[PDB]
Amino acid sequence: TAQTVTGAVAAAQLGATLPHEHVIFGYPGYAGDVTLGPFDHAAALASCTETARALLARGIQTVVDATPNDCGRNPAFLREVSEATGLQILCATGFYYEGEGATTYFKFRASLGDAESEIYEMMRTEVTEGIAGTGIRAGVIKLASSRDAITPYEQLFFRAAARVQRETGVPIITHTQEGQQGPQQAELLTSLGADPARIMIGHMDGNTDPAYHRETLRHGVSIAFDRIGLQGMVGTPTDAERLSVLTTLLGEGYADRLLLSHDSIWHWLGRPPAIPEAALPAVKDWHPLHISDDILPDLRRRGITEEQVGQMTVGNPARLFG
Amino acid sequence: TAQTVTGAVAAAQLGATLPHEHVIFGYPGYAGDVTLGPFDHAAALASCTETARALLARGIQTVVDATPNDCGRNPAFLREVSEATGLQILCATGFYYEGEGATTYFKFRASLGDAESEIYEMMRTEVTEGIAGTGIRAGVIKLASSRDAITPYEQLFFRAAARVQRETGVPIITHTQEGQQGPQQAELLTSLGADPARIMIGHMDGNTDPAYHRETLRHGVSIAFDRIGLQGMVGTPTDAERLSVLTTLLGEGYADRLLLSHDSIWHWLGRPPAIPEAALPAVKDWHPLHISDDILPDLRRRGITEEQVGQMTVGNPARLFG
Ligand SMILES: [Zn+2]
Ligand SMILES: [Zn+2]
Ligand SMILES: [Zn+2]
Ligand SMILES: [Zn+2]
Numbered sequence: 001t002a003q004t005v006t007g008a009v010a011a012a013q014l015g016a017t018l019p020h021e022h023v024i025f026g027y028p029g030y031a032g033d034v035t036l037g038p039f040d041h042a043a044a045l046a047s048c049t050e051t052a053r054a055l056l057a058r059g060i061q062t063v064v065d066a067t068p069n070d071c072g073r074n075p076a077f078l079r080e081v082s083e084a085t086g087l088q089i090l091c092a093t094g095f096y097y098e099g100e101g102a103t104t105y106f107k108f109r110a111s112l113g114d115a116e117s118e119i120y121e122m123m124r125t126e127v128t129e130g131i132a133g134t135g136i137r138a139g140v141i142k143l144a145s146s147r148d149a150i151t152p153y154e155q156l157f158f159r160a161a162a163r164v165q166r167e168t169g170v171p172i173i174t175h176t177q178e179g180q181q182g183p184q185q186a187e188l189l190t191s192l193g194a195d196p197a198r199i200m201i202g203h204m205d206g207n208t209d210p211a212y213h214r215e216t217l218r219h220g221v222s223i224a225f226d227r228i229g230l231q232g233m234v235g236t237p238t239d240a241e242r243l244s245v246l247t248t249l250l251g252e253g254y255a256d257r258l259l260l261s262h263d264s265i266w267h268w269l270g271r272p273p274a275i276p277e278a279a280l281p282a283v284k285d286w287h288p289l290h291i292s293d294d295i296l297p298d299l300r301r302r303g304i305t306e307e308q309v310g311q312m313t314v315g316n317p318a319r320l321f322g
Numbered sequence: 323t324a325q326t327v328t329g330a331v332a333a334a335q336l337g338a339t340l341p342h343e344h345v346i347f348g349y350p351g352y353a354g355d356v357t358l359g360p361f362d363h364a365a366a367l368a369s370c371t372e373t374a375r376a377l378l379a380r381g382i383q384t385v386v387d388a389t390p391n392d393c394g395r396n397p398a399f400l401r402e403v404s405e406a407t408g409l410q411i412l413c414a415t416g417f418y419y420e421g422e423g424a425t426t427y428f429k430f431r432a433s434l435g436d437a438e439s440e441i442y443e444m445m446r447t448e449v450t451e452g453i454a455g456t457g458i459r460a461g462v463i464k465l466a467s468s469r470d471a472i473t474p475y476e477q478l479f480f481r482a483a484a485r486v487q488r489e490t491g492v493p494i495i496t497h498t499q500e501g502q503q504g505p506q507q508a509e510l511l512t513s514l515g516a517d518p519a520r521i522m523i524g525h526m527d528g529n530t531d532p533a534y535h536r537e538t539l540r541h542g543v544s545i546a547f548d549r550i551g552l553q554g555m556v557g558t559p560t561d562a563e564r565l566s567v568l569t570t571l572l573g574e575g576y577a578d579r580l581l582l583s584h585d586s587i588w589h590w591l592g593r594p595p596a597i598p599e600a601a602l603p604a605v606k607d608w609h610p611l612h613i614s615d616d617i618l619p620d621l622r623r624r625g626i627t628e629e630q631v632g633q634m635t636v637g638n639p640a641r642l643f644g
Binding site: 026027028029030031032033034035036038068069070073095100101102103104108109112113121125126130131132133270271274275276 | 453
């Protein structure tokens, strides 16, 4: 049973799923720019429902919204987008990595007490009871680490998460910064007793060395090439490079542990970002319709079977989030 | 004319003022802990109005709320507390220092464009038009720097502020981290054309070397001993030490450029902080009634005249914020 923003749905009902996307997203601090960067709800609702309908048209029935608690997460809004289109959306519980999250609060709590237990309580409540007194439960726990290490701050969340996972069985999806720490996250979470069949190490497409992936897959966890379409930003590689590594892994029988997504942001919070035309190519295909329209057909063209595509897009998510 | 959350008030109406306090405050990230750390509005309103009334009983008619945009600032709430008690409250516009603020957003904007102009637009609008479409205007601009330097991130705000100051005349109050950068802030703001008679370098009581203060006062700016009562936390000195430096400066005729406050937080956002009894003495007198009840009477006992006390508590704020 997967927990979505509109209630629990049987794993069989999940269908084709995009395991890591962002309906709305805001970098910490966006709320302080509310005067000139307010949230136009009607505009957002219209834009997001349109994208939701575009996904449903492509066979995608479920989206896992990976937005951390400190990056604009809004379950009520997600629920609104879901009830208006029929698109199933799971939301998360967790904080972003130390490098970009709103870290002051829990760094403070950690100095005056047991932040881990507090973080554990938050996650447990949001997963089993609800978020902000809305009854909307998180369907996944979101974890994130920095590029050079899983910082002590971040480890507070990893430890709390592993515990909620053991006692709830809820799935865990993560963020790896600039193609590193995938093996470490997997090692850390599994050593803490977390179920490797309910863990998805994200942004693994950020590294182009298959050895890095296999070394992460060794832990039994699933890995996600979830920034397909984002070619150039934040150090990411090109899709050509992503598919090269992905086909190699598929050729080594890893289909059952590979997932695909875009890490797209349907509607930004704060003032709309100014995209310099020099970065236009890098974000050209960075939208939720890219995998369906270009990627899957391309994989088939290069030899990937329909069974493997079904495995990555339906089989894997049904098991990981169902 | 001073701009408060309930409208403009003549400088003569300001009266005894606490130039740096926090009705509500939350460390960035507190919003992500909304499930277990929600804002109990009625409780907050009751507690804050009670403190407001306690201040009015002591002759204090005005409070300058220094809460940055990214630390829980809520003008509507402040307005509510003001209309319910008659206590005049000015609110601010600005972001916290890089060390503890929600810096991700504007650091991002600064990489894709001219963050300074954007920060300038925000401040200008909030000071001259209103905040979040409420009509409530900021009566002061809040600036903050780190301990080892005024970082490039922070300088974006200093530059934008100096510009709004020149064209609006609005006052500027600041945050200095761990007793440093006072001279630099004053130097920087004055070199940018900002009116030194409308600048108040805060947390100057964080340094116990009078040379440091005089060296800051050289710029014609006013300085605030605004953490009176906080003895031990975040590196702060004891009040005995604060008053030693303060009496020395008063003995050197600086009364017209010295202000007093507590940097208190009436109601915390997020889960109530857990105060280890070991820190009980350090925060014992860290509340808004400390200066009125213990400090001013003590100054008088040690030779400070009533004229000087009136200068610091009424004369100075009328000029700086009026
Ligand atoms: Zn991520
Ligand atoms: Zn993401
Ligand atoms: Zn401060
Ligand atoms: Zn303060």
